[PDB]
């Protein structure tokens, strides 16, 4: 009795909690189509907002749109859709968060971040488990977090740091290959014409 009261499911998805039915009032969740005159018409179709993400049991339903339905869970998009869809979903979520407060950031700064997010083909995080696991140098990784562990890993593995970053050259004190320091100036011997 406790088993059939607390565990079994009559209908629905066990990973989905409260479900709401609503009509959108703005031209963002409406269906925008092209009429015969060439104008854009926004149709306010009925739509679902469910708490809990499992779209293997949602998109595979009888009357669910397989195209416009997305999710806010980035890892599940990675194990369902792909890494470029992860990039697009992260860009869309960042745009939604910035437009909730009305703050506008340019698309290029967001796209650079989102292409950094998909650099290795999987989901790297801006933490000590995604930055320190990169193929970068030792002073790239120790100067952010876990300095001693990265230093002993480089010492034990005899890791070669090729001095290509900026904080590496900041530590060792010469001009970094960065910004206006990414080139060398040479004196032209032939161009030394008449002077004073």
């Amino acid at each position: 009795e406790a088993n059939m009261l607390s565990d079994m499911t009559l209908q629905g998805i066990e990973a989905i909690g409260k479900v709401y039915m609503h009509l959108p009032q703005t031209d963002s969740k409406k269906r925008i189509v092209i009429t015969e005159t060439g104008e854009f018409k926004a149709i306010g179709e009925w739509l679902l907002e469910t708490d809990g993400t499992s779209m293997m049991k949602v998109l595979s339903e009888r009357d669910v749109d397989p195209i416009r339905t997305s999710s806010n869970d980035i890892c599940e998009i990675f194990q369902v859709l792909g890494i470029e869809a992860v990039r697009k979903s992260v860009e869309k979520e960042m745009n939604a968060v910035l437009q909730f407060y009305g703050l506008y950031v340019n698309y290029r700064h967001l796209a650079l971040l989102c292409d950094v997010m998909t650099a290795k083909g999987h989901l790297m995080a801006i933490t000590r488990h995604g930055i320190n696991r990169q193929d970068t140098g030792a002073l790239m990784r120790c100067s952010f977090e876990e300095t001693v562990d990265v230093l002993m890993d480089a010492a034990a593995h005899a890791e070669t740091d090729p001095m290509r970053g900026v904080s590496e050259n900041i530590i060792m004190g010469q001009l970094p290959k960065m910004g206006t320091g990414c080139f060398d100036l040479l004196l032209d011997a032939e161009k030394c014409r008449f002077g004073i």
């Binding site: 206006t180 060398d184 100036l185 040479l186 004196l187 032209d188 032939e190 161009k191």
Partner: protein, 84 residues
């Protein structure tokens, strides 16, 4: 890795990161009493002399632009065009 002049695929327009360092290096060279290529109109701050001889593109500085494949292209001052 000497890239030939006809093989150079970098831009022909000198950006401000090159402009600041070439102006500073040339004005420093004048500050150690280098010969001045153009006529002087009473200017005493060698940074101003560095601009007014950068206008006629008579500064003997070769810019060694570094490509990501560890190859370098040499661009002269008069080959590049002033823009601001």
């Amino acid at each position: 890795g000497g890239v030939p002049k006809s093989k150079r695929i970098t831009t022909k327009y000198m950006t401000k990161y090159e402009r600041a360092r070439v102006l500073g290096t040339r004005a420093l060279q004048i500050a150690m009493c280098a010969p001045i290529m153009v006529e002087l109109d009473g200017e005493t701050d060698p940074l101003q002399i560095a601009m007014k001889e950068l206008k006629q593109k008579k500064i003997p500085i070769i810019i060694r632009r570094y490509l990501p494949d560890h190859s370098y292209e040499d661009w002269s001052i008069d080959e590049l065009i002033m823009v601001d």
